[PDB]
Amino acid sequence: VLDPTVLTNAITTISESTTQTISPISEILRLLQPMGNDYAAFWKCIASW
Amino acid sequence: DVITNVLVARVDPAQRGDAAVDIRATHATFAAALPVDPAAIVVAMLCGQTETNLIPSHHYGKAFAPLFASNAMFTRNQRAVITREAFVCARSAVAQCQDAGFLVPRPLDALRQFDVTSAAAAEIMHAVNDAFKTAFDLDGALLDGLALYGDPRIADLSAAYLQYGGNVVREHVPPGPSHIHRALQQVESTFMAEM
Amino acid sequence: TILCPWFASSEDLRLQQVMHLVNISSNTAAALPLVEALSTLLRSVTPL
Amino acid sequence: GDDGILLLPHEAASKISADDMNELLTCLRDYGQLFGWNYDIDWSDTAEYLKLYALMGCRIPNTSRHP
Amino acid sequence: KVFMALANLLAQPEPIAIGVPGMHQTTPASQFSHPGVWPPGFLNPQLIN
Amino acid sequence: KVFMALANLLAQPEPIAIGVPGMHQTTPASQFSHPGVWPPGFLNPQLIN
Amino acid sequence: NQPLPRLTVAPTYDSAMSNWISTTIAFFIRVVNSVNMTATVNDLTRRTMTGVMTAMRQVKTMTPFYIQHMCPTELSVLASVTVTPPFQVPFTRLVQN
Amino acid sequence: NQPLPRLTVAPTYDSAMSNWISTTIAFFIRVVNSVNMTATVNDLTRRTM
Amino acid sequence: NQPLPRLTVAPTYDSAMSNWISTTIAFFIRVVNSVNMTATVNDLTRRTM
């Protein structure tokens, strides 16, 4: 199974969800996805092998 | 010797194939900053004053008196014994269900154990921690952030700082000599003969 | 025969603080309560 | 005037026991009995110097004072 | 940050060498936050004429 | 495409030449999709100083 | 790839993708901690972005174990259940000819 | 002319524009301090220019 | 560091803090009384600084 909550708890300790929001939030804007996407592009990438 | 990073890890880089690589990667960094105004300090460092008849030996003896009559100076000292003995007995709980983990004696090794995964040890060490906080009646954050990476199987607390000229200290902390862990080792030894 | 158990060794106290630094967040918003916990006691008992 | 603020020393000011303060104000109220001075002592941890009030360093404008 | 604050505001009268190519004399002193971008005249004041 | 993606980002701070003719270090990773276009410094890292 | 072991301590970090992650991140830490980055990045944010990567490097993930030990013995079975059998060409680790 | 830099840029004084400006100011600091200006203009407002 | 004083305390200039203060004032007076600032700033308001 694929659960991003482990790395979310690891990135929360250095999250700083307030201002100077240039670098670290732009990571998790394309890294969190609770309802953002399914993990299809990973399994699609295995199936192409 | 500019202290670029101050480095603390949960997992030691030994059982993980991680010893030769750089210490910025083998630990986690304390990133904090306090932007204090120099304009506030100049009209503080050049500006403060005390009274004329003040003597700091009498001042401090009156000043620190209501904060040493309390028992809080001894509280963190008797939590360090509890934190250590929670840490050894949860290191030993994981490393005995694992096959040849840390250098711990394994008296229950005749018993069957199959699922030795990371979530397996996570459901052991949290089950140790929940059965340790309840037993010694404390509600603090004992052993909770140690499972942050998701791997209690390899968990040795270490600390370091990387100076700019490549220097490092790597003064890692081992656990101290335990007493309740050696009781559990004796309970497990008499278990196998009297199951 | 009193028994008032309080003291840990220095090896036990340094083991607790690393796990206290493990349990804490590594950002500036989690070490800010520590620097002001002492700053309150610095303002509290001071000659200056 | 008749009223005034008593201040406690900065070392043991806020860390004083309330049981010690109740024994102080009992002696202060009995101190004015030597003069007939009925002290109107208040121990509410607020300021009142000349009919003006405070709460944690915030001035409290008595709206009932000026109708 | 102290040394490149005065060295910031005097650039026409007093130039000194900055070793890294990204930074110059008029670079703001908030950016001088790496040990390798210390000016060589600040390590050795004999280098400055 | 992985090597050139970093090599695009440090064109002036790491000014290295690429032995493919007519093409430069400001050429993206999307272009490098043919084996005759792989850089010789990527083939032999001893060419990279 | 290798056959599937009993999931003990050393066969979860011995994977080639664990070799790939734990050395790319170890390389990309000294990229942001280099000398040329500080024209835009601050010392706090150099100390912060390093902390993001060294957390990403040390999150326990089992997808290196899957891709090393479990995924071939699934692709070998799922090849024989598809109607269209797998068309496949060989791979090349940087040989160019 | 110099080629385009791809690094972080800062205002410098080595250009010929700055060579033109900082040497015609250096000439009119001489005209103001010249003998023809000395007898006419008051000294404290001669330093002001 | 110094040990805690046993006598009545007075403001004094022996301290290394005061050595930091009384020498960084001594430099910035030479900044004010420099040739790079004499010709620009009026003599009536240099000694005010």
Key words describing this protein structure:
part of a larger assembly; 9 chains; A: 49 residues; mainly alpha; 3 helices; 47% helix; elongated; D: 67 residues; alpha+beta; two-stranded antiparallel ribbon; 9% strand; flat; viral protein; Reovirus; transcriptional enzyme complex; NTPase; VP3
Question: Topology of this structure?
Answer:
The structure is cut from a larger assembly and holds eight copies of chain A and one copy of chain D (67 residues).
Chain A: H1 5-12, H2 23-29, H3 40-47
Chain D: H1 18-31, E1 53-55, E2 58-60
Antiparallel strand pairs in D: 1-2
PDB class: viral protein
Keywords: Reovirus, transcriptional enzyme complex, polymerase, RdRp, NTPase, viral protein
Entry title: In situ structure of transcriptional enzyme complex and asymmetric inner capsid protein of aquareovirus at primed state
Structure in words:
The structure is cut from a larger assembly and holds 8 copies of chain A and 1 copy of chain D (67 residues). Chain A starts with a helix and ends with a helix. In chain A, 47% of the residues lie in helices and 0% in strands. Chain A is built from 3 helices and no strands. Chain A has 49 residues and is an all-alpha fold. With 67 residues, chain D is α+β, with helices and mostly antiparallel strands. Chain D contains 1 helix and 2 strands. Chains in contact: A-B, A-C, A-G, B-C, B-D, B-G, B-I, C-G, E-G, E-H, E-I, F-G, F-H, H-I. The F-G interface holds F 6, 10, 13, 35, 38, 43 and G 31, 36, 96. The PDB classes it as viral protein. Keywords: Reovirus, transcriptional enzyme complex, polymerase, RdRp, NTPase, viral protein. In situ structure of transcriptional enzyme complex and asymmetric inner capsid protein of aquareovirus at primed state.
